[PDB]
Structures are given as C-alpha cells and as structure tokens.
Amino acid sequence: TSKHQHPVDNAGLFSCMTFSWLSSLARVAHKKGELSMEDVWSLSKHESSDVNCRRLERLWQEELNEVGPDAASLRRVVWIFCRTRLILSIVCLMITQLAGFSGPAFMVKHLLEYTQATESNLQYSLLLVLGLLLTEIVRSWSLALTWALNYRTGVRLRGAILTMAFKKILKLKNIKEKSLGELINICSNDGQRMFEAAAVGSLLAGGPVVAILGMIYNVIILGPTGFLGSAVFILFYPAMMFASRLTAYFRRKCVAATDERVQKMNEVLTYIKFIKMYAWVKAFSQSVQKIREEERRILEKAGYFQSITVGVAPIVVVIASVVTFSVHMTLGFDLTAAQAFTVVTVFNSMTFALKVTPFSVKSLSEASVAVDRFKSLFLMEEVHMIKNKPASPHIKIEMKNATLAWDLRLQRTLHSIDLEIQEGKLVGICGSVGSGKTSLISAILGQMTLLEGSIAISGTFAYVAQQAWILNATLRDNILFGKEYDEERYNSVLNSCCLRPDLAILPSSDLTEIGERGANLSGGQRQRISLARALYSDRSIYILDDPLSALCAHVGNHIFNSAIRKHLKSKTVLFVTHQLQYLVDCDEVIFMKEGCITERGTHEELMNLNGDYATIFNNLLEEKGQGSVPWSVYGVYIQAAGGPLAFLVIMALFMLNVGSTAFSTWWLSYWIKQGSGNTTVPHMQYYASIYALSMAVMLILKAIRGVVFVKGTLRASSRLHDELFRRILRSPMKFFDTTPTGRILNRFSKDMDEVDVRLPFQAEMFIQNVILVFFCVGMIAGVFPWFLVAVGPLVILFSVLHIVSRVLIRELKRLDNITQSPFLSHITSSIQGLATIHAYNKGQEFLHRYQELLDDNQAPFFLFTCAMRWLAVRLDLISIALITTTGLMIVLMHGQIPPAYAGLAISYAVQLTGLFQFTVRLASETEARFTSVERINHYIKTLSLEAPARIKNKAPSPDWPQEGEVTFENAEMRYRENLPLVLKKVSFTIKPKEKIGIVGRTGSGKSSLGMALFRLVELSGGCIKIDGVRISDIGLADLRSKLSIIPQEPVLFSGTVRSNLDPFNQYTEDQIWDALERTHMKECIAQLPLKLESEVMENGDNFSVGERQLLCIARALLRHCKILILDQATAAMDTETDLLIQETIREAFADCTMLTIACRLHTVLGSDRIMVLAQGQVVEFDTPSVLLSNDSSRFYAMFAAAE
Ligand SMILES: Nc1ncnc2c1ncn2[C@@H]1O[C@H](COP(=O)(O)OP(=O)(O)OP(=O)(O)O)[C@@H](O)[C@H]1O
Ligand SMILES: Nc1ncnc2c1ncn2[C@@H]1O[C@H](COP(=O)(O)OP(=O)(O)OP(=O)(O)O)[C@@H](O)[C@H]1O
Ligand SMILES: [Mg+2]
Ligand SMILES: [Mg+2]
C-alpha cells in the first residue's frame, strides 16, 4: 500500500460488515471542524481505473467481434458487468421484506391480546419481546447490508466508462462534426446518469414479492376476496410502461435541445478578444435567451407528468380493500371483532415498500437513452495510419497520382499528384491560393481523405502547424516537452534561435507561467517557441508550415543562415514558402498549380522554360469555504421572481391537505371504535361515498400543488441563470487571462444538472415531513398531556447526533465539489491540438494524467453516501432500543397500570419514532444538497466587472467623427499590473488625412500602437484625444463603432457569413455582392449553391487562411468606419494579388485616416511617412525619401540588409 490503510478491504472479523470504520474520521471532523486533503483515504487498487477498464474493453471488443455489429443493443454495459453484485441485493430484499412483515403483524396482535387480560399470565411476554427484537435487528442489518453493496458496486461502471469514452475521443478525426460542446456534456452529465441507475434501479423488484404475500394473506383471512386484488393489480401494470414510453421521448428531445446551447457557450469563451469592439454582445444574448426559453418550456412539459407520479395514488390498494369490505358487508360479517384495525394498518404499511417504484422506472428510462447515446458515439471511422500501399528504399516520402481534397462530398481540389523527396535535401513548393500547398502537407499525416493513388512514408515527424499551440506549463517545460534536462544542447538551442534577449527581458527568470493558450505573447514569439521546440525535439523528418511568415527580414535571414543552414543540415527538411528571397540557396523547387504539377526539377532550370514568377524575382515592383452554510443563500433563492406569493400558496395548500388527511384519519379511528357489526345497520355506504369523494379532493389538491411547485422552481432557476450570464459576459479581460476556462464552464454543466433535477423532490419531502411532525406533536400535547418528560432527552440526543454528523457531511460535500474543474479544463485544452498530439505520438502521458485526475476526483464520492448510511443505521438502532425499553416497561408495568391509557402507547410511539427517523435524514440530505446555489452565488458582484457599455448621460454629438487627429502622449502600459513596462515614452501627433506604415524588428512592439484607443487596459498614466475630444470620458458602446480594425488572425463564427456581415441587418442585398466582387471573388462564392447563406464554422475550416483573410477584408469593407486600420493584412498572400488589394484599398478609403501594417518593405514604400521602433521607443522618423539617402539611418541599414 504505502499510501493509506483503507480499512474497507481487510479486517474480515466483526468490524467491517457494520458501518464502524467511519468512527475514526468523525473525531477529526469536529476536532478541527474540517477535513483536509491529507486524511481522505484515497481509493485502493480495487476501485481503480486500471483493472476494471481492461476487463470492460475486452468484453466490449469480444461482443463486437463475435458477430456482425449491427446494433449489439449495448446490453453489456449493465446486464453483464454489474450482474453478480445485484443478485445479493435482490436476495436480501426478500429477507428484509419478510422480517419487516411477519414479526410486527403477529406481535401487535399478541400484545393486544395480552393487554386485554393481563390477569391470565405474566411470563408469556418474554418470548414475544425476544422475537420482536430479533426481527427488528435482522431487518435493520439486512437493509444496511443491501445499501452498502449497491453503493459499492455502483462506482466501477462509471469509472470505467468515462475512461473508455476519453480513449475513444483521442483519435484522428478529419473534422469535428459533433458540436464540440456536446462532447464535454457527454463526459460530465452521462457520467452521473450511469451511476444513479446502478444504485437506485434495484428496488423495483420489491413490488411483486410483497403483492403476492398480501394477496395470500387476504385469501387466508377471507375466502372470496382473493380475486379482486389480482384484478386491480393487473390494471396497474401497464401504467408504468406507458409512463416510461412517454418520458423517454421527452428526455430525448430535451437533451437534443440542450446539446446546442452549450456549444455556443464555448464560442465566446475562446474569442472574447475578438467580439469586444463591434458590440456583437447583443445578437448572441438574444439567441441564447431564445434557446434557453425553448429548453425551459420543454423541461416543464416533461416535468409536469412526473409530479403526477410521485405517489398521486398509492392508495389504490386501500381503496380496493375498503370497497371489498363495504360491498361484501352482511352487516356483521360474523368475523370482525378484534382485528379490524390491525389488517388496515398492515395494508397501510404496505405502501412504504412500493412508494419507490416511480423513481426506479424514471431512472431506468433515462439510462436507456443514455446507453443509446453512448452507442452512437462509437461505431465510427478510425481513419489514421492506414494506407495499404508499398514503399521504396532510399526515400522518405513517395506519392503516386494522389487525388485528395477536404470533405467525401466536395469537389476535388488535388488530382494526379506525383513527387519524390531525396534524403537530406531542401525543397520549396511555391504557388498561389489555388493548388493549396497545405493539403499536400497534411496528406501524409493521415488526416486527409483518400480515393485513389499511392502514398508511402517511413520515419518520424516533428510537425509544425500554420498556427501555434501552447500548453499551460512553464516556458522551460514547454521547450522540453517531457524530456530530460541538459546544459549544452539547451544552451545551443537558446543561442540558435536568437531567443536570448526575449528571455532576458522577463521580469523574474526563464521559468515563468505562460497562460492557457499563449495569450500573453505575440505571434512572432509563439512561432519562435514552436520552432525551438521542433528543433530541440531532434526528430528524423522536419515539416515546417511557413515558419517565416509573420517575422521580420533581419531575424528571418539570421535564423535561416544559422539554424536551418547549419544546425539542421544533417537531416531532411521539407517546407513551403511564398517568398522567393530564400529560394536561391534551396536545392530543388517543385511547382504545382490547381492541384496539378506542371514543372519540377533544379531551381536553376526555372529561368527560360517559364518565367512566370521570375517577373516578381526580377526586381522591386478555487477557495473552499470554512464555515457552515448561512441562510443568505436561502434568502436569495426565495427572493426569485414571484417567490413569497408562490411559497405562501404552496404552504397553505400543504397545510389544508394535511388538515384534511388528519380529519379523515380521526374519522376512520372513531369509526373503528364502534359496534362489531349487526348494529345501527345504510350509513356505511354513505360513509364510503364520502370517503371516496374526500380522497378525490386530496388528489385534485396534490395535483394542483405539484403543478404550482414545478412552475415556481423552474422560473427561479431560469431567472438565476439569466442573471449569471450577463455578469460572466461582462467579465473584464484580466479575469479571462488569469482564471482558466475550465473554472468557468463547470458552473454551466454540473451545477445546472443538480439544481433542476434533485432539489425540488427533497425540498417537498422535507416540508411534508416537518408539517406532519408538528401536527403529531401538537396532537400528542392535546390528548393525554401528562407525558412530556422523555421529549427533552429525545430532542437533545437527536440534536447531538445531527450536529455530530453534519460536520462530516458538509466537509465531504465541499471537498467533492472543489476538485472537479481541472477535469473539464484538461478535457477542453486537449482537444484543439489533435494534429500535433498525433504527430508527436504523445497520447499516453495525457491519458495517464486524465486517469490520475479522475481517480482523485472520484476518491471522496463513496464516503459522502457512506456517511449518510452510517447516520441512518445509528438512528435506527437508537429508536429500536428506545421502543424496546418502553415496551419492556409496559411488560413489567402490567399489573397496576390500566390498559385504557396504555393501549395507544405503542401506536403513537412507532409513528413518532418513524417520523423523527425520516426527519433527521431529510434535513441532512437537504443541507448537503443546497450547496450548488451557494457555489453559483460565489460569482456575485464581488467579482470584477467589465466596462460600462455606455453612460447615456454625456454622449457626444452625432457629428463627432469629422477629423482623424490623434495626439499620443506618454502611453506606458503593463498588461498585467505586475509585469514590467512593455512600451515606454510613446508620444505622437498625427495630422488628419495622413498615411503611416508600420515595420520593425520582431519581439518589441508590432502591433505596438494598439490599445490606449478603443482601450480596455485601465490606463494609469497619459491620455489621448480624438478630434479634440478625450477618450476616457466618452462612453464605450458608441465609441467602439466609430472606427474599425481588421485583426491579423481571421475569426469566423458558426451559422453563416451573412450574420457576421450584418449584426442587425442594416444593409441591402446588392451592396454585399458588389463588395465581394470588387476584391476578386467572382468565382469564390458562385462555386457553391449557397450565395450568402454559406455554412462556415470552426474558424472557416473549409477554405484556408488565403480565403479567410479576404473574407474579413470584404466584411470590413462594408462597415465604412471613420478610421479603418489594417493589422498585417498581407500575412500569407501572393504578390500578383497584392496590387489589386492595395489598389482597391486606396480607391475605397481614399480620404480616410489609416495606419497600414505590413511585414514587407516593398509593399509599404508608397506611404507618405514611415516610422520604426527598436525595443520600446520610436526613433526619429520622416518621409521614406529623406531616410533613403541617409547612411546613419537604421531604416536604410535594415533595407540594405534585407537583400
Ligand atoms: N497579451 C499580453 N499579455 C501580457 N504581456 C503581453 C501581451 N502581449 C504582449 N505582451 C508583452 O508586451 C511587450 C510588447 O509586446 P507587443 O505585444 O507590443 O509585441 P508585438 O509588436 O505585437 O510583437 P511581434 O512583432 O512579435 O508580433 C512584450 O514584453 C510582450 O511580452
Ligand atoms: N480547414 C479546412 N477544412 C476543410 N476544408 C478546407 C479547409 N481549408 C480549406 N478547405 C478546402 O480545401 C480547399 C483547399 O484550400 P487550402 O487549405 O489548400 O488553401 P491554402 O492555399 O493552403 O490557403 P492560404 O492561401 O489561405 O494560405 C479550399 O478551397 C476549401 O474548399
Ligand atoms: Mg497553410
Ligand atoms: Mg501585435
């Protein structure tokens, strides 16, 4: 072991069958008033996701491969895995039923006979009391054993199924196509559903075993009454199956409706920096409110039928028995003299066992659709590393007339591709936005669908993507990627990528936290980190997807001359490019167009055959609470919309119902104390009719109260969620930067499952229990008020026990809820990088971390239920001992105590006891469960808030955007409130109608002049004004729409391109077509049947960045803002299209004030003025002509060094 004793799996002597191992933790629970992480007794090797998972996998694979897998019914999840553990429960249920039935029924009759004439004997009670004690002890022990077995056996199934699902998730999928938000919802919600169905769905078998016993007892006491019970039970059978059939469809529709809502919830989380400038927070709010309203309506419709089956009529049996008694009544019956109320009380006690059937049937019906869903997840294509084609030696990559394109129902893009690569050679492709030299790179990975051709490959890859993927670990761990530390190789890597000043500028040291996805670094730094990791990993084959795009000229030249030329000269490097500056030193160049290779060979041969591109080459052109749950959460919960009125109506209805049932009980009790037939006999029929109509009322009343309660609780939940969403949406940027996303999404997946499912039932049950107890104590105080002595000791000991167990219950629940968020964080952050993870073949480490996190989360689940079972056992034992003592008292005190004042003693007692036993358990249950509302309230207004959309008090005149005067003055920022300054002493004065180009060294600042305008930075020093009007005083909502920005990284939401094009439908139909046509996409849209309703998702995955950039250009063209700024709009674009692009930009915004950003000097030479910055400061600047004839100018030096 060496970790924890875990006394469950040993100590076979009389120490572990009863719940006694938890007495050790009860001391520590109240000694410190807490329970930390070091004394939780983590799970042993028995309940570990390493032994059961293998067995489940083997069983499922065998059941798949035995015959053709058409559907397989997924019967092996439940019926064959947890089978042997259910036979013991189903065989102990019969024992406990018989023990609870046979004993008391005869004992009460014998005690009544003894209280009739005690004067006969005195020692005849000892056998009776001994039998009573034996039966009670046997019953309680059997019940505790059954619950313990089911609780223990309900965990392993979920523990194995979760890891099976994740292991299936980690596979090569060409596209998601699964509404990614669904996958997370599959991991959490369906985890819970597979648990309850294994721990509750086992008491359904307890119905018939007692029904047959009741029928045979009735036929043995009365002759011809053995036929009506069977007839009235046959009619009861199909109602349950009808209920299940009706609820299955409702559950399926509800889960389908809630599938989509959580997907749109993820889109804002990972794109908040994008939709924070165009005030697109309005459409999404309306869309999510509409889908939430639809979900709430269907949930209410589903739940209305349930409230009618929480025991609307378990009195069918008593109604049938009363009808049989009244109809057959021959005015005396010649048999009913002493045991009149005994049989009625026994039959009333029968409802306790069968009151739990609806819960079992509902859980089974839900588990059916859960099984269907999990079956739907499997039976999909495992397309990865399958080619089934021969290879050849002395080569690494070989192709033979491949014909590939994105997704099986789309027009082919590549046809008849054939190429070869020699070992240790450098090859460049080059081309346009046509042939698409990104499908070729991904073809050999295995992510590309295949139709024909032949692909062969043998080796290892160090993949680099066009974008960047950065984990949450520290920088040194990111560079190492799970490798052994070194000193010489690490220093060589750091010196070979020109990374030294970047590491020196860090505040503390190299070891620093990065973030969720490298949100604290620029694009160039992320590219450099990815390149350094690929360089240090030391793999056989290097694949670079344009690693020299966003970076400058000098650093790129140095890296190519130092790293690629020398440090990587002993391996094979294959990379594509759009710039022909470095193609001189390359070995071979292969040119392909429109998916077809035209000419290939030595680069020196591409001079006279076709000088197409040569014209370009010619010259220049959390925290866990440490206290008890206060009443503030309850006050907030009841202060929801329509709270007090609904609560008062519900309480009044409940009080009236309890009064009615009390009056009926008194009526039947009085009727019991009457003549034994053959006297005063017509009134019986009238009384039966009165009783029948009374029941009716109660029923009607119970239906009404259920309806009202369901409506009120659902309204409260909807209002709470609607309040929460706006607060999360207006969260400042720093909160999103520090706190990971897995800490926010949890409150939207797990809390909403428990608040809207389990809470109302427990609340209503506790309310009913407390009103019944108060009525019983009032009645006891009413008649026979001379017995009010034991009440004090009873209440004080019960309070002592409750205050003893509540500490453990609360601490265990809090520790259970705390440790579930890193789970979701990891499962979210390990999906987006499927390509890189598959390339590096690093699934095992992620899987092991997943398993360890799952076990840590599952550790405190068992003890939470074990504590409640232990409390129930203690309460039952105490009550049994007290009633035994009171009965023995009776026994002894049977000579000089009249029976008139003692006949009802055992009666009222058993009720009182039972009522207290139920009350304590219900109170503990609700106190445990009411922590989710507090957890949601943890994000109350104490959290930071974004900035005030507007103000509506000092809005500027509508004619404000007239001049583009900008006056920068001392703009110094920190970006983290702790990090050192990134830009210092920035002051500019730009006259209206001016053009300025941006170019400079990597790192440093570029984009440098971003922020401090449309700013959300919490400016501390300096201030700027636009057109003579300050920026701090004016509101944000109006100001953000005045100017427009084209982001460097394209962003494309789901739905359609139109919705992005018009946030509010303020443009006609021809203007958008003209805008799309003007930028040379005449055939880029008409190629599809949809014209303006294109299906775009997942950041435009159909067409690559070459088209996403121009889509964003077209979108920003129609806005026509006062100031339109382009942030490096020529990242990956050809040279021929450049002119057209800049010509269109100049034609459109001829007089607008703009600041152009580009990575190429030759494409910025036309600007009126230029400026450059070295590290954090701007050097002297003027027109390009002035600085061109200046040897001592950095701009001329870098232009000359650009070659
Ligand atoms: N989101 C961020 N959070 C915190 N610090 C940041 C963030 N972005 C940049 N920095 C830091 O601010 C300083 C200036 O970087 P800046 O963003 O201006 O670079 P850049 O000009 O965009 O770079 P590149 O040319 O590589 O794209 C650097 O120290 C950088 O690490
Ligand atoms: N991420 C994607 N997922 C699915 N299909 C894609 C994706 N990107 C592009 N497509 C489809 O495949 C075709 C080929 O585009 P490809 O990705 O090869 O472009 P590219 O030339 O490399 O891009 P760029 O010029 O923007 O750098 C597109 O016209 C489109 O039909
Ligand atoms: Mg690419
Ligand atoms: Mg930038």
Can you describe what's shown?
This is ATP-binding cassette sub-family C member 5. It is a multi-pass membrane protein. It is found in: Basolateral cell membrane; Golgi apparatus lumen; Endosome membrane; Cytoplasmic granule. The protein is mainly α and 1203 residues long. The chain has a domain at 1052-1120: 3-Layer(aba) Sandwich (Rossmann fold), CATH 3.40.50. The protein is built from 42 helices and 18 strands. The strands form 6 sheets. It has a 6-stranded mixed sheet. Strands 2-1-4 form a 3-stranded antiparallel sheet, with no helix packed on it. Strand 8 and strand 9 form a beta hairpin. The chain is elongated, with a radius of gyration of 39 Å. It starts with 22 loop residues before the first helix and ends with a helix. The relative contact order is 0.08.
Which labels suit this protein?
1203 residues, mainly alpha, Rossmann fold, 42 helices, 18 strands, binds adenosine-5'-triphosphate, binds magnesium ion
Computed Rg: 39 Å
Helix fraction, binned, reads: 40-55%
Question: Which overall shape is indicated by the principal axes computed on the Cα atoms?
Answer: elongated
CATH H-level homologous superfamily name of the domain at 1052-1120? P-loop containing nucleotide triphosphate hydrolases
By secondary-structure content and strand pairing, the structural class works out as: mainly alpha
Q: Give the termini separation.
A: 67 Å
Largest sheet: 6 strands, mixed
What small molecules does the structure contain? adenosine-5'-triphosphate, magnesium ion
Count of runs of 4 or more consecutive helical residues: 42
PDB class: membrane protein
Keywords: ATP-bound hMRP5 outward-open, membrane protein
Assembly: monomeric
Entry title: ATP-bound hMRP5 outward-open
